[PDB]
Amino acid sequence: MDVFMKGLSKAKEGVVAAAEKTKQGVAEAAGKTKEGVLYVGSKTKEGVVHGVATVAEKTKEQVTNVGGAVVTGVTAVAQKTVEGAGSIAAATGFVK
Amino acid sequence: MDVFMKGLSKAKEGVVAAAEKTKQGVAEAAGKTKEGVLYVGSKTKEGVVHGVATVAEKTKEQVTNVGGAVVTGVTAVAQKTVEGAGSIAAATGFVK
Amino acid sequence: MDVFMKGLSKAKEGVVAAAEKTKQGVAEAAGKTKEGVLYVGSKTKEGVVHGVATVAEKTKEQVTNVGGAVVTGVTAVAQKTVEGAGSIAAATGFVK
Amino acid sequence: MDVFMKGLSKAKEGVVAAAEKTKQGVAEAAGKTKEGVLYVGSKTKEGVVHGVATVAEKTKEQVTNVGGAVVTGVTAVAQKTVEGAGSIAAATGFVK
Amino acid sequence: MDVFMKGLSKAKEGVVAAAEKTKQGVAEAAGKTKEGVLYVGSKTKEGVVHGVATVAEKTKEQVTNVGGAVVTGVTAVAQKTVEGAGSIAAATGFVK
Amino acid sequence: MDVFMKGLSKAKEGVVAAAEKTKQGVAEAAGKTKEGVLYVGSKTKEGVVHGVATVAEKTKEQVTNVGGAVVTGVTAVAQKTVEGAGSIAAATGFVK
Ligand SMILES: *[C@@H]1O[C@H](CO)[C@@H](O)[C@H](O)[C@H]1NC(C)=O
Ligand SMILES: *[C@@H]1O[C@H](CO)[C@@H](O)[C@H](O)[C@H]1NC(C)=O
Ligand SMILES: *[C@@H]1O[C@H](CO)[C@@H](O)[C@H](O)[C@H]1NC(C)=O
Ligand SMILES: *[C@@H]1O[C@H](CO)[C@@H](O)[C@H](O)[C@H]1NC(C)=O
Ligand SMILES: *[C@@H]1O[C@H](CO)[C@@H](O)[C@H](O)[C@H]1NC(C)=O
Ligand SMILES: *[C@@H]1O[C@H](CO)[C@@H](O)[C@H](O)[C@H]1NC(C)=O
């Protein structure tokens, strides 16, 4: 009995790394439990409406680089070691 | 019995790293439990409406670099070690 | 019985690192428990409306660098070690 | 040699009647005459851009009439007579 | 040699009647004459940009009439007579 | 040689009637004459930018009439007669 959007339950030694560049309209998390209930002579209505995110959106990204090195975007790195060596490189630029 | 958006439950030795550049309209977290209830002769209405995020949004990013190195964006790094060595590099620029 | 937006429950030795550049319309956290209740001859209405974030937003970022190194954005780093050495570098610029 | 948007030229005994409920983006009137001109070694650019009128427009008109007579809209009437009689009726409501 | 938006030229005995409920973004009137000109070694740029009128406009008109007569809108009437009789009625309501 | 927005030129016995309920962003009237000019080694830029009228405008008109007669809007009437009779009625309400 549990509901998650991005989580974890009943875990040992957890390592989590995350990153987002998102535009979410509705990220609603709902747990609806309905037990032991009676409806003699009744009208019931439940709803979730218009989960729109964006309209008429204009986005422009221009990158002009001459003899250089730039980093743009989203990056996530996670690493665990009991013993040893971990050599990890992401989005690196070496210029000579 | 629990609801999460981005969390964790019943965990030992947890390491979490996160980062966002988001534009969320509605991030509502709801737990609706309904037990032991009667509705003789009644009208019930429940709703969540218009979870819009943005309209008519204009975003522009211009990067002009000459002989350099710049860092833009979102980055998250998490690392755990019992014993040993961890060499991790992200979004690095070496120029000579 | 609990609801979280970004939190954690019943954990030992927790390390959390986070950072945001967000524009959230509604980040409401709601726990609605309804037990032992009667509605003979009644009208009930519950709602959450118009969770809009932004309209007509204009954002511009211009970066012009000549022979340099600048850092822009959101970065989060978390690291835990029992014994050993951790060498972590993020968004670094070396120029000679 | 002349340019008009809604006008008249070299006329005798003119009668004009007009009415609008318009939403025009660009109603620009341009007369561009280019004579006796030289362009040795040159770059020339001329332009008209983004003549947008409206975005994300919401318009609602509700008319609820019980046993009545209402007038809505745009009406234009023009009449000329040398001799005689002119009987003209527009958008009339007779109730008994 | 002349430019008009809504006018008249070289006319005798003119009668004009007009009425508007407009929302114009740009109603610019331009006369550009370019004669006897030289451009050795030059760059020329001419432009008109972003003639937008409206964004995110919300307009609502509700008319609720019971046993009556109302007049809404734009009306223009023009009439000329040398001799005689002119009977003109517009947007009239007779109730008995 | 002349530019008009709403006017008249070289006319005899003119009758004009007008009325507006407008919201104009830019109603600029420009006459640009360029003759006898030289541009050796030069850069020329001319422009008109951002003729926006309105953003995020909300307008509401509610008319509730019971057994009456009201007049709303814009009306313009013009009439000329050499000899005779002119009977003109606009937006009239007769109740008995
Ligand atoms: C780890 O990675 C680095 C570069 O990030 C590399 O030079 C090295 O050899 C790797 N190994 C160890 C044991 O450091
Ligand atoms: C760790 O990473 C660095 C660079 O970040 C590298 O020079 C080194 O060799 C790696 N290993 C150790 C044991 O330091
Ligand atoms: C740790 O990282 C640094 C650079 O941040 C590196 O020079 C070094 O070798 C790494 N290891 C140790 C044990 O310091
Ligand atoms: C003119 O029109 C009216 C109604 O508008 C009508 O009663 C009449 O007979 C018409 N003729 C004359 C000559 O008035
Ligand atoms: C003119 O119009 C009126 C109503 O507006 C009408 O009663 C009349 O007969 C018409 N003619 C003359 C000559 O008045
Ligand atoms: C003029 O119009 C009126 C009403 O406005 C009408 O009663 C009349 O008969 C018309 N004619 C003359 C000659 O007055």
Numbering used by the authors:
A (entry chain C), B (entry chain A), C (entry chain B), D (entry chain H), E (entry chain G), F (entry chain F): 1 to 96
Give excerpts from the publication.
Amyloid-forming proteins such α-synuclein and tau, which are implicated in Alzheimer’s and Parkinson’s disease, can form different fibril structures or strains with distinct toxic properties, seeding activities and pathology. Here we report that O-GlcNAc modification of α-synuclein monomers results in the formation of amyloid fibril with distinct core structure, as revealed by cryogenic electron microscopy, and diminished seeding activity in seeding-based neuronal and rodent models of Parkinson’s disease. Our results show that posttranslational modifications, such as O-GlcNAc modification, of α-synuclein are key determinants of α-synuclein amyloid strains and pathogenicity.
We focused on O-GlcNAc modification at S87, termed α-syn(gS87), because this modification site displays the least inhibition of α-syn fibril formation, thus providing an opportunity to obtain homogeneously O-GlcNAc-modified fibrils for detailed analysis. We subjected α-syn(gS87) to aggregation and used TEM and cryo-EM to visualize fibrils, revealing various fibril morphologies, including double, triple and quadruple filaments comprised of two, three and four protofilaments, respectively. The most abundant species was the double filament, which had a diameter of approximately 20 nm. Due to the limited number of segments present in the triple and quadruple filament morphologies, we only performed three-dimensional (3D) reconstruction with the double filaments. The 3D classification resulted in one main class with two protofilaments seemingly related by a twofold axis. The resulting density map, with a resolution of 4.97 Å, corresponded to a crossover of 1,221 Å, an optimized twist angle of −0.7° (assumed to be left handed), and a helical rise of 4.92 Å. Modeling structures at this limited resolution cannot necessarily define molecular features, but the density map could fit a reasonable α-syn(gS87) model comprising the residues from glycine 7 to lysine 96 and an extra density corresponding to the sugar on serine 87. This analysis shows several salt bridges potentially holding together the two protofilaments (sb1) and contributing to the folding of the α-syn(gS87) fiber structure (sb2, sb3 and sb4). The electron density confirms that α-syn(gS87) fibrils are quite different from both the pathogenic unmodified fibrils we prepared here and the amyloids isolated from patient brains to date, and our structural model potentially explains how O-GlcNAc statically forces a different fold. In the full-length fibrils, O-GlcNAc is stable against removal by OGA.
